Design a protein around this ligand. Structure first.
Ligand SMILES: [Mg+2]
Ligand SMILES: [Mg+2]
Ligand SMILES: [Mg+2]
Ligand SMILES: [Mg+2]
Ligand SMILES: [Mg+2]
Ligand SMILES: [Mg+2]
Ligand SMILES: [Mg+2]
Ligand SMILES: [Mg+2]
Ligand SMILES: [Mg+2]
Ligand SMILES: [Mg+2]
Ligand SMILES: [Mg+2]
Ligand SMILES: [Mg+2]
Ligand SMILES: [Mg+2]
Ligand SMILES: [Mg+2]
Ligand SMILES: [Mg+2]
Ligand SMILES: [Mg+2]
Ligand SMILES: [Mg+2]
Ligand SMILES: [Mg+2]
Ligand SMILES: [Mg+2]
Ligand SMILES: [Mg+2]
Ligand SMILES: [Mg+2]
Ligand SMILES: [Mg+2]
Ligand SMILES: [Mg+2]
Ligand SMILES: [Mg+2]
Ligand SMILES: [Mg+2]
Ligand SMILES: [Mg+2]
Ligand SMILES: [Mg+2]
Ligand SMILES: [Mg+2]
Ligand SMILES: [Mg+2]
Ligand SMILES: [Mg+2]
Ligand SMILES: [Mg+2]
Ligand SMILES: [Mg+2]
Ligand SMILES: [Mg+2]
Ligand SMILES: [Mg+2]
Ligand SMILES: [Mg+2]
Ligand SMILES: [Mg+2]
Ligand SMILES: [Mg+2]
Ligand SMILES: [Mg+2]
Ligand SMILES: [Mg+2]
Ligand SMILES: [Mg+2]
Ligand SMILES: [Mg+2]
Ligand SMILES: [Mg+2]
Ligand SMILES: [Mg+2]
Ligand SMILES: [Mg+2]
Ligand SMILES: [Mg+2]
Ligand SMILES: [Mg+2]
Ligand SMILES: [Mg+2]
Ligand SMILES: [Mg+2]
Ligand SMILES: [Mg+2]
Ligand SMILES: [Mg+2]
Ligand SMILES: [Mg+2]
Ligand SMILES: [Mg+2]
Ligand SMILES: [Mg+2]
Ligand SMILES: [Mg+2]
Ligand SMILES: [Mg+2]
Ligand SMILES: [Mg+2]
Ligand SMILES: [Mg+2]
Ligand SMILES: [Mg+2]
Ligand SMILES: [Mg+2]
Ligand SMILES: [Mg+2]
Ligand SMILES: [Mg+2]
Ligand SMILES: [Mg+2]
Ligand SMILES: [Mg+2]
Ligand SMILES: [Mg+2]
Ligand SMILES: [Mg+2]
Ligand SMILES: [Mg+2]
Ligand SMILES: [Mg+2]
Ligand SMILES: [Mg+2]
Ligand SMILES: [Mg+2]
Ligand SMILES: [Mg+2]
Ligand SMILES: [Mg+2]
Ligand SMILES: [Mg+2]
Ligand SMILES: [Mg+2]
Ligand SMILES: [Mg+2]
Ligand SMILES: [Mg+2]
Ligand SMILES: [Mg+2]
Ligand SMILES: [Mg+2]
Ligand SMILES: [Mg+2]
Ligand SMILES: [Mg+2]
Ligand SMILES: [Mg+2]
Ligand SMILES: [Mg+2]
Ligand SMILES: [Mg+2]
Ligand SMILES: [Mg+2]
Ligand SMILES: [Mg+2]
Ligand SMILES: [Mg+2]
Ligand SMILES: [Mg+2]
Ligand SMILES: [Mg+2]
Ligand SMILES: [Mg+2]
Ligand SMILES: [Mg+2]
Ligand SMILES: [Mg+2]
Ligand SMILES: [Mg+2]
Ligand SMILES: [Mg+2]
Ligand SMILES: [Mg+2]
Ligand SMILES: [Mg+2]
Ligand SMILES: [Mg+2]
Ligand SMILES: [Mg+2]
Ligand SMILES: [Mg+2]
Ligand SMILES: [Mg+2]
Ligand SMILES: [Mg+2]
Ligand SMILES: [Mg+2]
Ligand SMILES: [Mg+2]
Ligand SMILES: [Mg+2]
Ligand SMILES: [Mg+2]
Ligand SMILES: [Mg+2]
Ligand SMILES: [Mg+2]
Ligand SMILES: [Mg+2]
Ligand SMILES: [Mg+2]
Ligand SMILES: [Mg+2]
Ligand SMILES: [Mg+2]
Ligand SMILES: [Mg+2]
Ligand SMILES: [Mg+2]
Ligand SMILES: [Mg+2]
Ligand SMILES: [Mg+2]
Ligand SMILES: [Mg+2]
Ligand SMILES: [Mg+2]
Ligand SMILES: [Mg+2]
Ligand SMILES: [Mg+2]
Ligand SMILES: [Mg+2]
Ligand SMILES: [Mg+2]
Ligand SMILES: [Mg+2]
Ligand SMILES: [Mg+2]
Ligand SMILES: [Mg+2]
Ligand SMILES: [Mg+2]
Ligand SMILES: [Mg+2]
Ligand SMILES: [Mg+2]
Ligand SMILES: [Mg+2]
Ligand SMILES: [Mg+2]
Ligand SMILES: [Mg+2]
Ligand SMILES: [Mg+2]
Ligand SMILES: [Mg+2]
Ligand SMILES: [Mg+2]
Ligand SMILES: [Mg+2]
Ligand SMILES: [Mg+2]
Ligand SMILES: [Mg+2]
Ligand SMILES: [Mg+2]
Ligand SMILES: [Mg+2]
Ligand SMILES: [Mg+2]
Ligand SMILES: [Mg+2]
Ligand SMILES: [Mg+2]
Ligand SMILES: [Mg+2]
Ligand SMILES: [Mg+2]
Ligand SMILES: [Mg+2]
Ligand SMILES: [Mg+2]
Ligand SMILES: [Mg+2]
Ligand SMILES: [Mg+2]
Ligand SMILES: [Mg+2]
Ligand SMILES: [Mg+2]
Ligand SMILES: [Mg+2]
Ligand SMILES: [Mg+2]
Ligand SMILES: [Mg+2]
Ligand SMILES: [Mg+2]
Ligand SMILES: [Mg+2]
Ligand SMILES: [Mg+2]
Ligand SMILES: [Mg+2]
Ligand SMILES: [Mg+2]
Ligand SMILES: [Mg+2]
Ligand SMILES: [Mg+2]
Ligand SMILES: [Mg+2]
Ligand SMILES: [Mg+2]
Ligand SMILES: [Mg+2]
Ligand SMILES: [Mg+2]
Ligand SMILES: [Mg+2]
Ligand SMILES: [Mg+2]
Ligand SMILES: [Mg+2]
Ligand SMILES: [Mg+2]
Ligand SMILES: [Mg+2]
Ligand SMILES: [Mg+2]
Ligand SMILES: [Mg+2]
Ligand SMILES: [Mg+2]
Ligand SMILES: [Mg+2]
Ligand SMILES: [Mg+2]
Ligand SMILES: [Mg+2]
Ligand SMILES: [Mg+2]
Ligand SMILES: [Mg+2]
Ligand SMILES: [Mg+2]
Ligand SMILES: [Mg+2]
Ligand SMILES: [Mg+2]
Ligand SMILES: [Mg+2]
Ligand SMILES: [Mg+2]
Ligand SMILES: [Mg+2]
Ligand SMILES: [Mg+2]
Ligand SMILES: [Mg+2]
Ligand SMILES: [Mg+2]
Ligand SMILES: [Mg+2]
Ligand SMILES: [Mg+2]
Ligand SMILES: [Mg+2]
Ligand SMILES: [Zn+2]
Length: 63
RNA sequence: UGUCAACCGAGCGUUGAUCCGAGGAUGUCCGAAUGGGGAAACCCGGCACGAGUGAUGUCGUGUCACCAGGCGCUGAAUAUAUAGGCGUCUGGGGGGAACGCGGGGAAGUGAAACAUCUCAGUACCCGUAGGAAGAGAAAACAAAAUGUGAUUCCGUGAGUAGUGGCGAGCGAAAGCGGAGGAUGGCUAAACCGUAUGCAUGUGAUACCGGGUAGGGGUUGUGUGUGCGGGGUUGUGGGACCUAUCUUUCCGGCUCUACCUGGCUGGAGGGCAGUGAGAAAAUGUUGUGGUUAGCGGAAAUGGCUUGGGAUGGCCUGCCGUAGACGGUGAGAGCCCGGUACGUGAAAACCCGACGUCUGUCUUGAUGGUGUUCCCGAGUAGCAGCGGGCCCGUGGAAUCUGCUGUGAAUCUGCCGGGACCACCCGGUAAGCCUGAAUACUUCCCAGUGACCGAUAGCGGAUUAGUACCGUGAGGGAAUGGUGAAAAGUACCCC
RNA sequence: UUUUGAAGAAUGAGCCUGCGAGUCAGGGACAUGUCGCGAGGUUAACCCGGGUGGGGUAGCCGCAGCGAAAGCGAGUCUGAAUAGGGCGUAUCCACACAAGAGUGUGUGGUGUAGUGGUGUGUUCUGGACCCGAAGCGGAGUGAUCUACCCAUGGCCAGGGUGAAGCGCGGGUAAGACCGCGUGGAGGCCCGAACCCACUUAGGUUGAAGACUGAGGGGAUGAGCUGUGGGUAGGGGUGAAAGGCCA
RNA sequence: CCUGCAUCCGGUGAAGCCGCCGAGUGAUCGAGUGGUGGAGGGUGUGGGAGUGAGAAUGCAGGCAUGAGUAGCGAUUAGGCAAGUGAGAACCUUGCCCGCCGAAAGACCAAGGGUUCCUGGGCCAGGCCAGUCCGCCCAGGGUGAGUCGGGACCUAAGGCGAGGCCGACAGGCGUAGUCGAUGGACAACGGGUUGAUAUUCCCGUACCCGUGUAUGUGCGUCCAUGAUGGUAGUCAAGCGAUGGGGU
RNA sequence: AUAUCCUGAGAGGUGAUGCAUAGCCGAGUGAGGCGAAUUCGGUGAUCCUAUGCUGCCGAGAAAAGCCUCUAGCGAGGACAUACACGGCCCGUACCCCAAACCAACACAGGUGGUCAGGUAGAGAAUACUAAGGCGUACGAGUGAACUAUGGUUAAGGAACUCGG
RNA sequence: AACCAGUGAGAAGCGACUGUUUACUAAAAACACAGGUCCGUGCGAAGUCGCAAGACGAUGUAUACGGACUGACGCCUGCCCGGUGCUGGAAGGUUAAGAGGACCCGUUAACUCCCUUUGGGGGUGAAGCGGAGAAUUUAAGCCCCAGUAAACGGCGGUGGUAACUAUAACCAUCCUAAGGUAGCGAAAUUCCUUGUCGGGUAAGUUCCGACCUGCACGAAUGGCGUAACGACUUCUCAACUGUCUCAACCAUAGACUCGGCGAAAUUGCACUACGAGUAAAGAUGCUCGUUACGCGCGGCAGGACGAAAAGACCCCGGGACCUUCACUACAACUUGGUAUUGGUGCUCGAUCGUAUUGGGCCUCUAACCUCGGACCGUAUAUCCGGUUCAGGGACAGUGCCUGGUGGGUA
RNA sequence: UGUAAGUGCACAAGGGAGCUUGACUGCGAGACGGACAUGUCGAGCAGGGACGAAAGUCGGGACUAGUGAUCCGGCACCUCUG
């Protein structure tokens, strides 16, 4: 739950602000889920972490 | 025949010692440690080739990690195939004082308190290479001037325009003047060829510019990929037809033989070359400098005090050399050397002079109307955060994440919301030296800087003794005199 | 020294020789002397000179001010108002006009002085006269004593107390129960080593940075101890006292 | 005090120190004189100061009183004759007396590294003097097929090829290899020098390996046998990285 | 069935015509030579049989080695005797209930384990003692008070002290 | 016969016993201890450490495990559900993000009047581009209603009503939830207190047994007893003794002289009297007066505000830790939307059949999930990966925004 | 004699009656006391009003208490900017 193995999108770091205008540390992590990639026509897939961006763009096929 | 620091015994050298300059071998063990093991410098092996004993026991020289990337073989449950397994080559594991790039990232303290702020993007950490790095060829400014023309670094522009519990504080840009010259080059798209596959075929009147004609595969027609031409831009450009001008020879092809228009090979003549624009090697110069050395001028002058003249008085000489040190007391002419001249076996790097490599000349020049192209989850939009003076405020621009999601030249984006008219430009791919930053080391120089409680903690046994089981802390100790001639000898 | 008030019984001083304290940086600011120039002064960054010298007009202040502005100008803003007011035209004298509500309104003159270096007092930003804590964060180091647990050994001198069970003689129909011999279960009892620390006297510039002399509790267990291992600081551990962590 | 400039002094004695004599309204001065010394100084006028001490329970070094006062670190206690030598209650020899004796004795592991022996001396140390020493100097000294460890095996635990997770840094744990306080494993008595002893010697034992010779002696090539009975295997001898006992 | 096997204390023979010793001679920092008897009883273990046996519950390491089995290799190997050989690396002095270790010291503390004689004694307590080792590092004198550790004391016995 | 070698009894209080604790002032009435009750846990559990895998719980499965209060054994364990938590009913009101676009304006196409010639100067209006943007939708929390005291908690005063004196020993007044059941009581609780009564010696503010006037005893922060036990606290009795009237004597190690070595704290100065005075209010050091040869040794300690640690007690200023309905945040938990995210069916609505795009429910498998079984990588593997079989399944988990609880942390 | 006290008012500022909103706009010569900013009075000018024939008075209440800076923001208008 860190980075997409394909596009390598790492998490970004920022500062969270309360309604009292006081600052504090917080982190944002890109949406990535475990899916079996469709790359070989042979009909075999392997467990690889992927990101919604790559999945929806189809860089790893759906089948 | 190094040195602390005398002393003895031993020896070499004119047949060139010692010394210094360049290159070359050996180089026990640990230390990324990598034959295996482990509490640093200590224990135990395999394999091959040699040495030794009547044979084991023994001994010498090689070789015996891991990971990643190529290449070859092999193909499990399981069939296609993969994972996995073997053989062989190429690379990497650590260290380094400062200098860079991208991230993470704190608390003391001011506001006479303090949450926002500031301290500060500081200390520290992480991943990273170099001798420098990064950045870089406008989707840039400005405003009606017919302006500038890549980037970087300094001085102004000013403590102003702004911002802030409008407190404490924080802080630009444009333009202008300087250092440098390369206002440089590459790459995917529009279309033909070629190894292919996936396909399907009316498998025959379609593939080839016209005419004579032979046939049914340069597949008849589509798709994705590797390989060579033609193109690289803003007054838009590039691909197709249509006229004009056309600065070597020959061959094979445009299905085929014959004329017309195109594709490709073999030979002049230019073009550059270690180069960012393509890469590899091989044949002949600079008293270019550097790593040592060598030459190098003139008073034993006289008189005086003296232990000692390098002190005082009087006479000389050199000066392309009166910088600086030593010598028994302040030395141009005593010594070391200074001005100046020379000077290298080997090696270094620079520059210049020579085989070889490769694009183009099958090609270039100025026009025309039509059909296709100009960098995809991108630009923009909505939500949540950063840093620009802008501390969400009307919020421009850049950027991180999540959803939605566009077009190809009367297209698109920019001139601090936004609309209309004007003006500039062509992002979503990649390289690019010169102007700049720094010294752990070496060479040469300087001090209205310190002289032993000062000066680096360290002028001597120095990061030693010592303290602490640890990170770590951290001490004080120079002057005899010209030479030791360091007081023979006698006496208590 | 600090005190309104002290020779003090308010503090500092054993003696001696050394070491120890209003400086620096910036074209900063105000003020004050000093030198050139004079309606100008004035150079940065950067070039050429073993050298302090010579170039370098990019910049900054006075030269006109008023008004938030479109602007205007010896005037200007407020304003319906030459109608009074706010700011400015260096200052002055003289000449005329008004009231003499103190002064103002119009003409002519002498005519204005600022700017660069530098000495000195203060001030701005750097810790800015000298020295002086309890505490915070980041990064690292310790469970060899002390707490707990884990694997593996050793340790407890002597002497008493006698459950179940068992066999025999009684009781019963069988028992419970009644006596007789064996057994040593006991977080049982008295008492060594070891371990603990209750009272008491000494020590207190001690022999010892927490002991000694007399007495005091366990001693087969929640026992004692050796060997090697694990537990890291807003945390560990803790038969729980706000203890321990060299 | 250091410096630019111009001057003067100095082995016929420059700088500090200790006196005498004097001098200015002050911080002081003397080119006026005496002893010590041996190597650089003064005046005039400019520029720059780490430029002037008595106190902060200041710091480095040296030294005052209490002071020739307390103590000289237990629960046993010495005495005598002789010797050595300059020195003897503290050293050597001999004779009495006392103390300890679940230790105040004889040993192992951990712990230190030359404290062990021989020879030399007694300015450093021993709480006093020392001929003595756990002071130092110079030399010498440590002997394993069988004792403790390694080459044999394992635990609580540590490392960790692959791998999982994690923004990076990093946390986990498989196969394996490390880790005695355990298991198995083969020697005892006596003698010996100034220091070594299950180690050397004497006497007698035990456990693994290699070579040669000899004797039992069995097969490969013949072939009986048992068979499942022509033919195909075979039970010799080794025997596990595997199974099962211990 | 004391069948058969295993184990196995203790006893007995061998090791040993050897070694050592009480003692006798000369000989002294000491060495040399010679060298007797060595039978029977009592007491009695914390040591052996013993990983035994009997009770109890809180219910009690692994690997290696050894034996065996085949799988599998296999034509030389097994046994016995004799002769002649090899058997690897580190630890090895001295100090150990302390003047040599832990405590700043030549310290009134601590430090795991093994040896345990005689007499009285229940004893590994207590008293004197053998083997064995010590007189441990400032001394000599002196009826002061006072201090501290002991010893004794008429009659009352707790009347002091907050408190036997 | 030396040495060695337990005083005993009678009560009360507290605790059931043996045990453990503040190294270095406190060993207890403190702590735990076996008994019980309640709460929570359906199994890669809850609870943990760890942002994650994973590990413990357990190589176990409610006749167990985690949390809480109590403490052997005997007789027992009263009333109250308003407030706050917890478990249920959310059947209504309220509101976040997101969907949604009533109306409005800016903008110039087109224009509405003069004014020219080739849309502005004095208002209408299309599209596109933008802005605030309203009504409708929502889920949680909050308000509403029941249960729970071995959950945190509370359990009063007021008046009247006996045969002579004594008071309430029944009824009603306010309130809320009721206004102390058993048991005990001048106690480890009691200020007025040495309360009153009986025991104890001559004397008893201690002690023992009772009296109820319980400021301010009380039954799971338990009450009253209780065999045995306690280096726990208080009192009484016999024996004893130098603890006393009342002290005396003897020995050891110092204290003392002699010999040797040789110590520390402090220190402004010194040929450092006293009586009465004088002052920063207590004088060796000042005024008047009295006394007093110089220098030592052994003894005693009133003074020299003697030595020790920049006073702990007080205040000022600044820290640290702690508590909560003080403020502001965070972790964690929890609610919806949205992406991951698929197909077919029933059922509810805003331009009784006609149009509305979002809710509720049931199904199917391919996404996805399972510390389920069997095989292979594999000689040794409870790791890991792959194939297959078997179950869940468009949920859950996880990204982004958001509403709530939140002394667990800052 | 509205609201406490004092100072005043018998001429009125006590009461009664008719009309009317000067409880205006643009200004202000000078003084009052104050460390600072806050606080107090005022003659007189112009516009356009009120009362009164006129002379004349009116910039709230016989007098002294009935209140609050800075910053930020809202509303109307403006011959400012853009
Ligand atoms: Mg990731
Ligand atoms: Mg950041
Ligand atoms: Mg912050
Ligand atoms: Mg060399
Ligand atoms: Mg070599
Ligand atoms: Mg290695
Ligand atoms: Mg290694
Ligand atoms: Mg590779
Ligand atoms: Mg296949
Ligand atoms: Mg590196
Ligand atoms: Mg403050
Ligand atoms: Mg503050
Ligand atoms: Mg900043
Ligand atoms: Mg480089
Ligand atoms: Mg660039
Ligand atoms: Mg770029
Ligand atoms: Mg600027
Ligand atoms: Mg400031
Ligand atoms: Mg091309
Ligand atoms: Mg191209
Ligand atoms: Mg001379
Ligand atoms: Mg001369
Ligand atoms: Mg010179
Ligand atoms: Mg010389
Ligand atoms: Mg010189
Ligand atoms: Mg020379
Ligand atoms: Mg902002
Ligand atoms: Mg904004
Ligand atoms: Mg604009
Ligand atoms: Mg243009
Ligand atoms: Mg472009
Ligand atoms: Mg540069
Ligand atoms: Mg000196
Ligand atoms: Mg250390
Ligand atoms: Mg002062
Ligand atoms: Mg004073
Ligand atoms: Mg004063
Ligand atoms: Mg005074
Ligand atoms: Mg005094
Ligand atoms: Mg004082
Ligand atoms: Mg004082
Ligand atoms: Mg004071
Ligand atoms: Mg001093
Ligand atoms: Mg001192
Ligand atoms: Mg200033
Ligand atoms: Mg000035
Ligand atoms: Mg001047
Ligand atoms: Mg005026
Ligand atoms: Mg800290
Ligand atoms: Mg550790
Ligand atoms: Mg029984
Ligand atoms: Mg018994
Ligand atoms: Mg007893
Ligand atoms: Mg003592
Ligand atoms: Mg200490
Ligand atoms: Mg004691
Ligand atoms: Mg004791
Ligand atoms: Mg006693
Ligand atoms: Mg005892
Ligand atoms: Mg007792
Ligand atoms: Mg007991
Ligand atoms: Mg016990
Ligand atoms: Mg550690
Ligand atoms: Mg407590
Ligand atoms: Mg401690
Ligand atoms: Mg000088
Ligand atoms: Mg001279
Ligand atoms: Mg001289
Ligand atoms: Mg002289
Ligand atoms: Mg001299
Ligand atoms: Mg001068
Ligand atoms: Mg001067
Ligand atoms: Mg200066
Ligand atoms: Mg100074
Ligand atoms: Mg001084
Ligand atoms: Mg000192
Ligand atoms: Mg003293
Ligand atoms: Mg004394
Ligand atoms: Mg004494
Ligand atoms: Mg002693
Ligand atoms: Mg003697
Ligand atoms: Mg004894
Ligand atoms: Mg004994
Ligand atoms: Mg003993
Ligand atoms: Mg040891
Ligand atoms: Mg050792
Ligand atoms: Mg010795
Ligand atoms: Mg000697
Ligand atoms: Mg000596
Ligand atoms: Mg000494
Ligand atoms: Mg020696
Ligand atoms: Mg050996
Ligand atoms: Mg492991
Ligand atoms: Mg690895
Ligand atoms: Mg691991
Ligand atoms: Mg190991
Ligand atoms: Mg071991
Ligand atoms: Mg031995
Ligand atoms: Mg026995
Ligand atoms: Mg051998
Ligand atoms: Mg060895
Ligand atoms: Mg030895
Ligand atoms: Mg030793
Ligand atoms: Mg030793
Ligand atoms: Mg010992
Ligand atoms: Mg020591
Ligand atoms: Mg000692
Ligand atoms: Mg000791
Ligand atoms: Mg011990
Ligand atoms: Mg014993
Ligand atoms: Mg004795
Ligand atoms: Mg002895
Ligand atoms: Mg005494
Ligand atoms: Mg006594
Ligand atoms: Mg008597
Ligand atoms: Mg008596
Ligand atoms: Mg009394
Ligand atoms: Mg009493
Ligand atoms: Mg009670
Ligand atoms: Mg007890
Ligand atoms: Mg306890
Ligand atoms: Mg404790
Ligand atoms: Mg204590
Ligand atoms: Mg203690
Ligand atoms: Mg205590
Ligand atoms: Mg206790
Ligand atoms: Mg107790
Ligand atoms: Mg307890
Ligand atoms: Mg109960
Ligand atoms: Mg229980
Ligand atoms: Mg319960
Ligand atoms: Mg769980
Ligand atoms: Mg409970
Ligand atoms: Mg209780
Ligand atoms: Mg209790
Ligand atoms: Mg209720
Ligand atoms: Mg309720
Ligand atoms: Mg309530
Ligand atoms: Mg909407
Ligand atoms: Mg609720
Ligand atoms: Mg309610
Ligand atoms: Mg009572
Ligand atoms: Mg009671
Ligand atoms: Mg009471
Ligand atoms: Mg009382
Ligand atoms: Mg009483
Ligand atoms: Mg009493
Ligand atoms: Mg109470
Ligand atoms: Mg309760
Ligand atoms: Mg209850
Ligand atoms: Mg009781
Ligand atoms: Mg009595
Ligand atoms: Mg008596
Ligand atoms: Mg007496
Ligand atoms: Mg006597
Ligand atoms: Mg004595
Ligand atoms: Mg004494
Ligand atoms: Mg004495
Ligand atoms: Mg002495
Ligand atoms: Mg003092
Ligand atoms: Mg007085
Ligand atoms: Mg007095
Ligand atoms: Mg006083
Ligand atoms: Mg006096
Ligand atoms: Mg006095
Ligand atoms: Mg006097
Ligand atoms: Mg007088
Ligand atoms: Mg007299
Ligand atoms: Mg006193
Ligand atoms: Mg005092
Ligand atoms: Mg204090
Ligand atoms: Mg305070
Ligand atoms: Mg804290
Ligand atoms: Mg959503
Ligand atoms: Mg979703
Ligand atoms: Mg989507
Ligand atoms: Mg709160
Ligand atoms: Mg807190
Ligand atoms: Mg009236
Ligand atoms: Mg008004
Ligand atoms: Mg005025
Ligand atoms: Mg008027
Ligand atoms: Mg007026
Ligand atoms: Mg008025
Ligand atoms: Mg009126
Ligand atoms: Mg403010
Ligand atoms: Zn991706």
């Amino acid at each position: 739950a860190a980075v997409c193995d394909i596009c390598g999108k790492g998490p970004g770091f920022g500062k969270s602000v309360s309604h009292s205008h006081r600052r504090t540390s917080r982190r944002w992590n890109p949406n990535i889920q475990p899916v079996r990639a469709v790359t070989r026509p042979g009909g075999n897939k392997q467990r690889i972490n992927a990101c919604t961006s790559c999945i929806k763009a189809g860089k790893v096929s759906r089948a």
